[PDB]
């Protein structure tokens with residue numbers, strides 16, 4: 001690995017041993033760890049243990065930010081084991097507002113989209129993380145999507161903004177996938193999902209409705225699916241839909257069971273870190289509802 | 294209708310006859326209209342015709358912005374006849390950069406979510422509309438989705454961000470809908486979609502892959518579907534997906550047919566103003582791809 005040199009910064013490959021004590025001023029800070037995936041580390045020891053772990057991750061490429069006067073404001077770099085290239089940075093309070101994150105982040109992205117021969121980079125910032133959302137924007141990242149997430153050291157889940165930047169954007173891209181479901185009684189299915197999944201009839205044609213759309217959110221666009229009346233008595237071949245939801249599985253589960261829908265049983269925490277339960281329509285279709293917790 | 298008073302502005306219900314002249318400094322500007330739904334009006338006469346029309350919209354409710362120094366920097370307000378409360382605004386060149394739009398936008402927004410007794414407001418901004426997305430961000434509007442659209446007075450379609458603000462946020466909201474497709478050879482399907490639909494594989498469980506996810510975009514969260522391998526013979530009931538895409542159907546079509554996919558035929562203009570064509574997987578699954586044009 002090489003070193004990143006910026007206007008007034010010197011980004012050098014992370015050295016858990018050498019960098020532990022310096023970077024502990026960030027990792028050890030509760031004010032800084034406030035938005036992180038885990039609680040501030042108890043000691044430079046723990047920070048060493050942690051930093052090592054982060055650096056080990058397949059794909060990881062982390063640098064330690066070296067200020068002009070030696071000082072180490074913090075680190076930046078690409079995350080380990082992510083699929084789609086993830087960014088990450090962090091600074092100690094004492095360096096906030098110096099445009100470091102922006103300068104270091106800028107270096108990492110720039111390097112990644114060139115010498116690192118990558119296609120694009122992504123940054124996951126929590127909804128209220130004002131300071132970090134600013135850096136992202138300043139760096140060239142633009143909101144791509146959003147996702148829920150739960151940090152074990154936290155009371156409840158939270159919002160995550162997927163902000164990214166590409167080498168060259170894809171003119172041809174897909175905006176949504178509205179899968180269809182052939183149901184017996186459209187009007188009846190609509191009422192069920194309205195209740196069980198808090199959906200709302202985006203539109204419907206026919207009297208009674210022969211075809212409709214169920215928006216799973218109150219907005220013009222977003223998660224949703226259509227319905228098609230089955231012209232017959234012959235049982236329908238089930239369709240398996242997976243719904244990424246926000247909130248706690250319980251709250252979702254509860255809503256669904258309270259809705260009088262057919263629930264397979266309490267929510268189960270799968271190995272890929274997601275609690276889920278399935279809702280089965282009378283036609284046989286299966287909808288599994290997954291939440292961070 | 295009531296007036297809205299802001300820190301330093303006065304928003305009075307729009308008056309086509311009275312405001313026409315003032316507002317034509319915006320509506321008559323090509324600089325400004327590049328981002329509007331229609332070409333700059335030829336004259337105050339036309340602007341008056343236009344304004345009157347927008348004002349007639351069922352549910353419309355727009356205000357003319359009046360600065361302390363008499364002037365009218367532009368208009369702002371709620372759009373009419375849009376199932377989901379829409380926001381609109383525009384300023385004449387000469388007033389750009391004074392926090393006007395944000396001041397007026399915030400007013401319209403604040404009002405609608407209180408005295409206007411609305412549940413929420415939306416704003417559809419073109420992805421490249423920097424100046425406008427900033428205003429929307431400042432006012433409190435957050436990205437909710439994305440949709441393509443084509444303006445008759447333009448060459449090709451474009452992307453639109455649906456940014457929203459709700460009076461009260463919904464706890465249990467679905468984030469995404471990942472429909473599953475049963476295929477004979479997962480790894481074969483993947484190769485196909487990657488080329489025909491510019492997809493990319495997110496994950497593939499097993500070797501050869503028995504279960505996988507195909508992301509139709511390069512980002513962490515977004516439109517995508519999973520593939521499940523079906524063991525024995527027997528047929529598979531087709532699953533019909535609908536894919537809202539960005540770009541010209543032709544370009545989309547071209548790519549599909551070129552990728553050697555099974556295409557029913559060239560794109561087709563539908564009544565609901567959308568051009569589409571269908572790709573059929575060997576299993577029989579049918580995926581229709583529609584675009585604004």
Ligand SMILES: CC(C)(COP(=O)(O)OP(=O)(O)OC[C@H]1O[C@@H](n2cnc3c(N)ncnc32)[C@H](O)[C@@H]1OP(=O)(O)O)[C@@H](O)C(=O)NCCC(=O)NCCS
Pocket residue numbers: 325326328329380381382383384385388389390391392393394395396416417418419422424425427428
């Ligand atoms: C979007 C548009 C209104 C521009 O708004 P703006 O004038 O850029 O945004 P404001 O009106 O909130 O002015 C903000 C700017 O004024 C500055 N400003 C000056 N005095 C200010 C004050 N007292 N308070 C707040 N901001 C002030 C800000 O610093 C900011 O400068 P910055 O651009 O570098 O951020 C204009 O480009 C336009 O009319 N576009 C076409 C119509 C359109 O955008 N439609 C969108 C679809 S709904």
